[PDB]
Scaffold this active site. Structure first.
Site, PDB file in Angstrom:
ATOM      1  N   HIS A 131      28.600  53.905  50.292  1.00 22.23           N
ATOM      2  CA  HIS A 131      28.309  52.468  50.254  1.00 22.23           C
ATOM      3  C   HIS A 131      26.973  52.184  50.931  1.00 22.23           C
ATOM      4  O   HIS A 131      26.377  53.086  51.540  1.00 22.23           O
ATOM      5  CB  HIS A 131      29.405  51.685  50.975  1.00 22.23           C
ATOM      6  CG  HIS A 131      30.782  51.948  50.445  1.00 22.23           C
ATOM      7  ND1 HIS A 131      31.592  52.947  50.940  1.00 22.23           N
ATOM      8  CD2 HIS A 131      31.497  51.335  49.474  1.00 22.23           C
ATOM      9  CE1 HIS A 131      32.745  52.934  50.301  1.00 22.23           C
ATOM     10  NE2 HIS A 131      32.712  51.966  49.406  1.00 22.23           N
TER      11      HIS A 131
ATOM     12  N   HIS B 257      32.591  46.615  59.039  1.00 25.06           N
ATOM     13  CA  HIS B 257      32.167  48.003  58.830  1.00 25.06           C
ATOM     14  C   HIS B 257      31.292  48.124  57.590  1.00 25.06           C
ATOM     15  O   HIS B 257      30.740  49.188  57.322  1.00 25.06           O
ATOM     16  CB  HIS B 257      33.354  48.967  58.758  1.00 25.06           C
ATOM     17  CG  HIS B 257      34.077  48.964  57.442  1.00 25.06           C
ATOM     18  ND1 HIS B 257      34.704  50.085  56.937  1.00 25.06           N
ATOM     19  CD2 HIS B 257      34.271  47.987  56.523  1.00 25.06           C
ATOM     20  CE1 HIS B 257      35.249  49.802  55.768  1.00 25.06           C
ATOM     21  NE2 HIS B 257      35.000  48.535  55.494  1.00 25.06           N
TER      22      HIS B 257
ATOM     23  N   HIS C 121      32.579  52.446  60.659  1.00 20.87           N
ATOM     24  CA  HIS C 121      31.128  52.340  60.664  1.00 20.87           C
ATOM     25  C   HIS C 121      30.506  51.169  61.407  1.00 20.87           C
ATOM     26  O   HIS C 121      29.285  51.138  61.588  1.00 20.87           O
ATOM     27  CB  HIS C 121      30.588  52.383  59.236  1.00 20.87           C
ATOM     28  CG  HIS C 121      29.372  53.233  59.089  1.00 20.87           C
ATOM     29  ND1 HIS C 121      29.032  53.853  57.905  1.00 20.87           N
ATOM     30  CD2 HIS C 121      28.432  53.607  59.992  1.00 20.87           C
ATOM     31  CE1 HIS C 121      27.935  54.572  58.083  1.00 20.87           C
ATOM     32  NE2 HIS C 121      27.551  54.439  59.343  1.00 20.87           N
TER      33      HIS C 121
ATOM     34  N   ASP D 258      26.210  58.023  53.034  1.00 20.78           N
ATOM     35  CA  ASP D 258      27.365  57.167  52.794  1.00 20.78           C
ATOM     36  C   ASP D 258      27.560  56.894  51.282  1.00 20.78           C
ATOM     37  O   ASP D 258      26.629  57.071  50.502  1.00 20.78           O
ATOM     38  CB  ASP D 258      27.023  55.858  53.538  1.00 20.78           C
ATOM     39  CG  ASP D 258      28.217  55.028  53.892  1.00 20.78           C
ATOM     40  OD1 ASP D 258      28.960  54.609  52.991  1.00 20.78           O
ATOM     41  OD2 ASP D 258      28.374  54.722  55.086  1.00 20.78           O
TER      42      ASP D 258
ATOM     43  N   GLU E 281      34.389  56.990  60.366  1.00 19.47           N
ATOM     44  CA  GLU E 281      35.438  56.710  59.402  1.00 19.47           C
ATOM     45  C   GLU E 281      36.513  57.766  59.210  1.00 19.47           C
ATOM     46  O   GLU E 281      37.288  57.683  58.255  1.00 19.47           O
ATOM     47  CB  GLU E 281      34.832  56.301  58.062  1.00 19.47           C
ATOM     48  CG  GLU E 281      33.927  55.076  58.134  1.00 19.47           C
ATOM     49  CD  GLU E 281      34.686  53.758  58.081  1.00 19.47           C
ATOM     50  OE1 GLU E 281      35.916  53.755  57.914  1.00 19.47           O
ATOM     51  OE2 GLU E 281      34.049  52.702  58.198  1.00 19.47           O
TER      52      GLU E 281
ATOM     53  N   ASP F 172      28.854  58.771  57.319  1.00 17.12           N
ATOM     54  CA  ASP F 172      30.170  58.264  56.999  1.00 17.12           C
ATOM     55  C   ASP F 172      30.813  59.355  56.134  1.00 17.12           C
ATOM     56  O   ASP F 172      30.249  59.784  55.120  1.00 17.12           O
ATOM     57  CB  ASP F 172      30.043  56.968  56.189  1.00 17.12           C
ATOM     58  CG  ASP F 172      31.356  56.237  56.051  1.00 17.12           C
ATOM     59  OD1 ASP F 172      32.413  56.895  55.948  1.00 17.12           O
ATOM     60  OD2 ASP F 172      31.342  54.994  56.049  1.00 17.12           O
TER      61      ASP F 172
ATOM     62  N   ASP G  84      26.543  49.379  53.164  1.00 17.63           N
ATOM     63  CA  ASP G  84      26.781  48.772  54.471  1.00 17.63           C
ATOM     64  C   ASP G  84      25.694  47.767  54.872  1.00 17.63           C
ATOM     65  O   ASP G  84      25.360  47.633  56.050  1.00 17.63           O
ATOM     66  CB  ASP G  84      26.952  49.854  55.535  1.00 17.63           C
ATOM     67  CG  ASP G  84      28.256  50.634  55.367  1.00 17.63           C
ATOM     68  OD1 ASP G  84      29.227  50.081  54.805  1.00 17.63           O
ATOM     69  OD2 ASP G  84      28.303  51.799  55.793  1.00 17.63           O
TER      70      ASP G  84
ATOM     71  N   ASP H  41      33.014  59.134  54.020  1.00 16.20           N
ATOM     72  CA  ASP H  41      33.282  58.691  52.655  1.00 16.20           C
ATOM     73  C   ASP H  41      32.133  59.051  51.714  1.00 16.20           C
ATOM     74  O   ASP H  41      32.245  58.916  50.497  1.00 16.20           O
ATOM     75  CB  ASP H  41      33.694  57.200  52.560  1.00 16.20           C
ATOM     76  CG  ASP H  41      32.523  56.194  52.706  1.00 16.20           C
ATOM     77  OD1 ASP H  41      31.316  56.549  52.634  1.00 16.20           O
ATOM     78  OD2 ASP H  41      32.845  54.993  52.875  1.00 16.20           O
TER      79      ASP H  41
HETATM   80  N1  LIG Z   1      31.750  51.721  56.346  1.00 16.39           N
HETATM   81  C1  LIG Z   1      32.400  51.439  55.225  1.00 16.39           C
HETATM   82  N2  LIG Z   1      33.455  52.167  54.880  1.00 16.39           N
HETATM   83  N3  LIG Z   1      31.981  50.448  54.442  1.00 16.39           N
HETATM   84  C2  LIG Z   1      32.608  50.077  53.178  1.00 16.39           C
HETATM   85  C3  LIG Z   1      32.059  48.778  52.676  1.00 16.39           C
HETATM   86  C4  LIG Z   1      32.763  48.314  51.424  1.00 16.39           C
HETATM   87  C5  LIG Z   1      32.215  46.992  50.851  1.00 16.39           C
HETATM   88  N4  LIG Z   1      30.779  47.162  50.466  1.00 16.39           N
HETATM   89  C6  LIG Z   1      32.418  45.850  51.858  1.00 16.39           C
HETATM   90  O1  LIG Z   1      31.411  45.307  52.361  1.00 16.39           O
HETATM   91  O2  LIG Z   1      33.584  45.508  52.134  1.00 16.39           O
HETATM   92 MN   LIG Z   2      29.870  53.420  55.885  1.00 19.11          MN
END
Ligand SMILES: NC(=[NH2+])NCCC[C@H](N)C(=O)O
Ligand SMILES: [Mn+2]
Ligand SMILES: NC(=[NH2+])NCCC[C@H](N)C(=O)O
Ligand SMILES: NC(=[NH2+])NCCC[C@H](N)C(=O)O
Ligand SMILES: NC(=[NH2+])NCCC[C@H](N)C(=O)O
Ligand SMILES: NC(=[NH2+])NCCC[C@H](N)C(=O)O
Ligand SMILES: NC(=[NH2+])NCCC[C@H](N)C(=O)O
Ligand SMILES: NC(=[NH2+])NCCC[C@H](N)C(=O)O
Ligand SMILES: NC(=[NH2+])NCCC[C@H](N)C(=O)O
Ligand SMILES: NC(=[NH2+])NCCC[C@H](N)C(=O)O
Ligand SMILES: NC(=[NH2+])NCCC[C@H](N)C(=O)O
Ligand SMILES: NC(=[NH2+])NCCC[C@H](N)C(=O)O
Ligand SMILES: NC(=[NH2+])NCCC[C@H](N)C(=O)O
Ligand SMILES: [Mn+2]
Ligand SMILES: [Mn+2]
Ligand SMILES: [Mn+2]
Ligand SMILES: [Mn+2]
Ligand SMILES: [Mn+2]
Lengths: 298, 298, 298, 298, 298, 298
Positions: free
Chosen positions: E123, E138, E98, E121, E270, E225, E125, E227
């Site tokens: 999360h 990411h 990401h 997503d 991702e 994303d 981000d 995920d």
């Molecule tokens: N693009 C992603 N998969 N982001 C996941 C982020 C996970 C967590 N919030 C971090 O800053 O490490």
């Molecule tokens: Mn993401």
């Protein structure tokens, strides 16, 4: 010979919780019923009381995690086991992580001139605080029983060593730390890794093991860690290692041992219901016990 | 001997996309770290640039799909491999479909008086445009290297043949086209199909193979196709065939080869991340390389 | 409000062994850590001592299996729970089969004018010895708490009934015995089977449940049986029934309850490590507890 | 020798429905094409009509469930098989539970002076109404064919016994009832349980079996029950038992039999599509038939 | 509008290797053919060259792992994307972790007065070096694009911020770090966590999202994303979180967006073939793209 | 109304073998017992004799595979169904591929002034020889029943059409060929694809469907293809399509239909034991029939 079962709900020898549920997982897999059918006089002496661990930072050991609680639980086990042997019964210890082998051998060894040991396992369990890469005591019972390690562990039962290197046979090993390879090599311990099992075959490995020990011991203790079997056959263990012994090779091993009539004590360890799939691992253990104790297909 | 890794992102030898991701799937499975641990001077020379296929319709032969791109990439591979050997280093080629064997053998063979080959595979890979049921070049590398096939393939590196039939040993075969059975039979190539593996056991097959080659070659090239292992152990291949070699038999084979010290070049091919389960196949390949290169359990 | 955890290692309410390991499976799934993070004053009062069952043929009940041991364990639980409430703490009971609800409600109900109950379950648990098709007491706690059943069960804590039919809401039901359908219908108990959940949606079901109880009770006890969730989400239960509530619907339910602030006591039951897949069910329970106790995604 | 296929959609020998679908599941797995490819003159005589059982309470023996229907269907089978042999063709019978072996052996045996039998199975199938723990006739065909059991079963085809104990070889056994162990022991039937297969290896078990029978019979009938293979390889059976023969061991066995040229009739039974995973078991049977009938990898 | 595909083989935004294979895994899942079928003028501009990270110990910030390489690769992406927009084509970016969103938004935003963003997503981000619990870039692209974070990231393309908080809509969130919850709350970013999706339903969440953005933006970028979907639907991601959006909810979302005609640029990120099951995740992405770009069931 | 079951072991409407085992797979899943429990007078009239296909080469049309055998079996079915209706019984037809709908509707429709149809399916089944991309008749029954297609199919029972377009409702569709989309659109057939199911919810789709038909038909025939459910819930079908209706949505649909009391005939088709996992699909069908026929959770 009548059997006495002793459960040891121990998980302090390592860090994954749940292995303390192994004794009851096996009881629930029908260990008593299985053995009664073989017309055995089977008695279940219950479980050894295990104490709790104090704050790691507040106490004594990182190279020897939970040393005090592990040494104390092992003193208790050694006493219980010693008593069963004195009563002329076969001690069948259900774990619990492998650190309980320290207590089992402490209670048994004193009764034999030359006790032999068959360590059915994926690892060597011959580390010391100096060689251990984890500080987990379940990776040190064999070394400790041979008289190498912290005195709180080597002196359980008030004597040491419990056994001699030349009376030990490792089977199924596929993961040894460098210090352990050196230990095994230098102490001259007989070892059949997966290379030898693959190369020679389980029949030959067992024939040689049985003949080797029968030729120089007056008793043989079977210390079976379920991680000795492949994770596909025994998934409920804390330290799984792929490319292990199969379900069949294990039953063959147990059947050849029964046939030889050399096993005078035994322990099945590392069964962890919480890392398992519907009690599969406890069930394998019970089935293996059935073979060990005389079951025959024919 | 120091090792030089050469990735060959090739998928033009067959039709399933993704096998070109094999080299990096293996790099991600830790091939470098694994070998560095064995104290090797390991160098990664990167990947061979592979060209794109010509219009299927304006293409030379349906019996020889992507012939020009395949022959070109193989010329490059042969040169890169030739150089590594000239630098006194062991060439470890990561594929990529099996058609890259043409280039690997072209770069190596010129340096030996009698190079032997161990083809660890589920197939024979000895088809020609005439016998091929698919037109896929990944099913012709062995024949091409023996000097049988299209000149664009047999003449890679400017010479032929790269090896003699009496210096080849096929292991794990369980799928041969009729023309290939005739070819093998007539050229008198030594072959251990799954029947012999099942009947004789991997230990005996390996002992015989090693002795046979050791007795008549001055170097041995290991050409391992992951499809040689059972799809349950190595699912990430384009041409899976059930009833294959197990994880353990494969490690035993690698261990016996390591022990024999006869392997002078090697290639692991057909790893396809896109047909795999969480990189399992690349992982197996890396584990196998660890055994081949000297890892020992004891 | 501070929380006090009480484990009840009970399996006598049914026949499948292992559900007595539920309290510790949940502790191992991190129940304490989870709640501490929500800045709660969390206390673990340990486990209620459960007695063993005498020979079925030697004692009292088949329509009421293990009645004495079940009634005794429930008296103990009722006392422990009563005390926690008296200390002004929220009682969080971890089971153990659902028969423990008899003790939990016995300890809680006395402290409320009109205690409401949310029975999150696949079954009704409103059988009596007369209607029960199994004789398993874990299928009778709701009826017993409403004052219907054997006096050894209805009189726990010295009073009855603990709650009124009009203050009960069943959610997720998909398996009712004929006698139970009649019971529910006749006592006029509010019930949302999977038909209503499918038809109205979990949001509406929860909105209605919350409004209905908030409007007529001074406290609400959450009695959550993991079998209320689909077996694919919660496989570790003795009485699984397909077509259940999803992981998300369950978290939504817990989140809406937290939001409403109507839950004054709770119990999570039927977690059986021995019928589970790597503690999945205990983990779901702990996650659900996290939502119930205030966790928010935003 | 030309082959004649006879399907026997029988499930009355046991209680699990679906095994009557076995003949067609195998047909759909490509049995005809597989054999035609080996250049055989293959003929499919269709299916033997099976009747429906009479009211259990109106039936004569609970120790012999569905006796009439099973005996009737067996008379029909015996006639059809007898006819194929008379026509100089090889009878290939597809089941259907193992009770059909009574009919197959009845039609075959009369044509040989000393018919040998290889019972590839996880069980002994040598029970009588007296020793049977289930009353399921599919667990009695071997004993019945040896002349032991209910006359309705022992006299099929109008003669008895069909074969002698000294001409029978059991392979892969891992589940025998006490009565059966006594039977085998006392009748002196040659048996290779999983212990022997594990201990000696399939190659040796097959070499010995072939040499033993070749030395004293004038024809050999292969009665292969898919439950002889491990449930992981053949899940579609009604009586699965873990720790079975592998896919590879089974192909090796069939290949060594083909090589020996001793098999004069055969039957593949117990395939149950309804307990299977995407027809996996029917496919295994067909693949084994391919090996038995001459397929070769080389 | 014609589409231009730009692959960004990036894995430096996080620590799991393999996500750099995402662009090609999607190409192999048939992204081009899928879109050509919708009658699009589709062009594949290939991949953005990504550099290798410098020695971690020689790197400037552990809270900003691989900052240089990530910022560099992002400048290149921003340029390529800017160019596609200038050519009047729709930029479809395939990742890659990401962190590439920083580059995509940098090339797009400059062309709109009020670019809206839909962040599909699990999360947020929206971390910075100060709030990041991992140091993985990411997890910072949204905040960086909003103008919050390291200047090396916020100034990509030479301007900032790319978008305003009031023009952002987060959907499917179920894992936010504390710092991120504060960020979202304080910046007033519209967010629909799994609670809202569970509570309101995807249809309503999409209707509201579309109406909200349509009402205040002149272009909308979809940053999806994988995920965001449940790990059971999309297992091939480095940061999976259970209780996610379903396959159906995701297609509905894409279909309602297509219907609204508000999406002016998009990126699917991702996808990691190495953590996937037979390219399942890449396939989902491609199927979602098909819906987004106009596919209709009716 | 009493029920009469008619099995139609048909697989000639498509190419995958095994679907002819559907009727008995469902019988084995307990269809009779299930319905008897609902206190129904249930009668099983057995199976319709199905003929074997003519030489593919001498066959009428590749666009109409097995036309004569399919039309013949359908004539028989129509007659058997016509009789049941005339006897005042509800015809419950078990398939067998969907081409049997031609016969079911031929036997039923003649008895109604305006028969409605609910086609619960993943496809439209409204192809003709001209529009069919496969030539498989199981993809043409709806069109044929509406009077569009080959006369051998449209004239079954001696009349046409069996139903009107304005009396048909398709539910769960997610795979239509272009010609079918045109057909549906032009004939003005009411259709709820997965988009509408996802967007509106099953409750609303069912409410609308019931009201629509109730308002203009004098009888409603339920034609349920198991492929209408998601392959994860019903894997045993020849034409599976992901993103389908769930187990619960399907039970809700059946429950709402039962409640409405509008279904006057029904058929469950495409169950294929040979592509299934332990009869899961037949089981789902039987469970669905239980809901359709009145089962209630409350
Ligand atoms: N693009 C992603 N998969 N982001 C996941 C982020 C996970 C967590 N919030 C971090 O800053 O490490
Ligand atoms: Mn993401
Ligand atoms: N009983 C066991 N599972 N032992 C595993 C030990 C693993 C490793 N050798 C260690 O010392 O940590
Ligand atoms: N014969 C065997 N199974 N050997 C396993 C070796 C695996 C690997 N080389 C290791 O050292 O861990
Ligand atoms: N390297 C391989 N995977 N080869 C597979 C070859 C398969 C087949 N014999 C062919 O020629 O097409
Ligand atoms: N020994 C073995 N595993 N043989 C496998 C042979 C399988 C089969 N007959 C074939 O030709 O494909
Ligand atoms: N708590 C439970 N799991 N109850 C299940 C009860 C099942 C059934 N109604 C019975 O009374 O046996
Ligand atoms: N809406 C639902 N999920 N209903 C489930 C009903 C299942 C079945 N008819 C039963 O009575 O058990
Ligand atoms: N053909 C079979 N599957 N036989 C299984 C027999 C099982 C058991 N020995 C019995 O007599 O019931
Ligand atoms: N060699 C073997 N695999 N033996 C399996 C024996 C299993 C067990 N003792 C039984 O009698 O059931
Ligand atoms: N509506 C939902 N699905 N909520 C899931 C919340 C899960 C848990 N409380 C968490 O914060 O991680
Ligand atoms: N009843 C069915 N399964 N129909 C599938 C039809 C698939 C496709 N529309 C065809 O006409 O071939
Ligand atoms: N609402 C849905 N589930 N839509 C699924 C659509 C999937 C894809 N666009 C197709 O046309 O096949
Ligand atoms: Mn150990
Ligand atoms: Mn190959
Ligand atoms: Mn309950
Ligand atoms: Mn049998
Ligand atoms: Mn259909």
């Amino acid at each position: 010979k009548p059997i006495s079962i002793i459960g040891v709900p121990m998980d302090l020898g390592q860090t994954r919780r749940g292995v303390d549920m192994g004794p009851s997982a096996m009881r629930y897999a029908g260990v008593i019923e299985r053995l009664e059918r073989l017309h055995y006089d089977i008695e279940d002496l219950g479980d050894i009381p295990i104490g709790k661990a104090e704050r790691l930072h507040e106490q004594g050991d990182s190279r020897l995690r939970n040393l005090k609680a592990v040494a104390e639980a092992n003193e208790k086990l050694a006493a219980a086991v010693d008593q069963v042997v004195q009563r002329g019964r076969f001690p069948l210890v259900l774990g619990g992580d492998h650190s309980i082998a320290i207590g089992t051998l402490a209670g048994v060894a004193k009764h034999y001139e030359r006790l032999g040991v068959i360590w059915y396992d994926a690892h060597g369990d011959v580390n010391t605080a100096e060689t251990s890469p984890s500080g987990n005591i379940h990776g040190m019972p064999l070394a400790a029983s041979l008289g190498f390690g912290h005195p709180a562990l080597t002196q359980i039962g008030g004597y040491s060593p419990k056994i001699k290197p030349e009376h030990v046979v490792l089977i199924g090993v596929r993961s040894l730390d460098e210090g352990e390879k050196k230990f095994i090599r230098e102490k001259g311990i007989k070892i059949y890794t997966m290379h030898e099992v693959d190369r020679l075959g389980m029949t030959r490995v067992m024939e040689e093991t049985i003949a080797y020990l029968k030729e120089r011991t007056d008793g043989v203790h079977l210390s079976l860690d379920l991680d000795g079997l492949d994770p596909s056959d025994a998934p409920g263990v804390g330290t799984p290692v792929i490319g292990g012994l199969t379900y069949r090779e294990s039953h063959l091993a147990m059947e050849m041992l029964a046939e030889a009539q050399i096993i005078t004590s035994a322990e099945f360890v590392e069964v962890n219901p919480i890392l398992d799939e519907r009690n599969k691992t406890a069930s394998v253990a019970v089935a293996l016990m059935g073979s060990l104790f005389g079951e025959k297909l024919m």
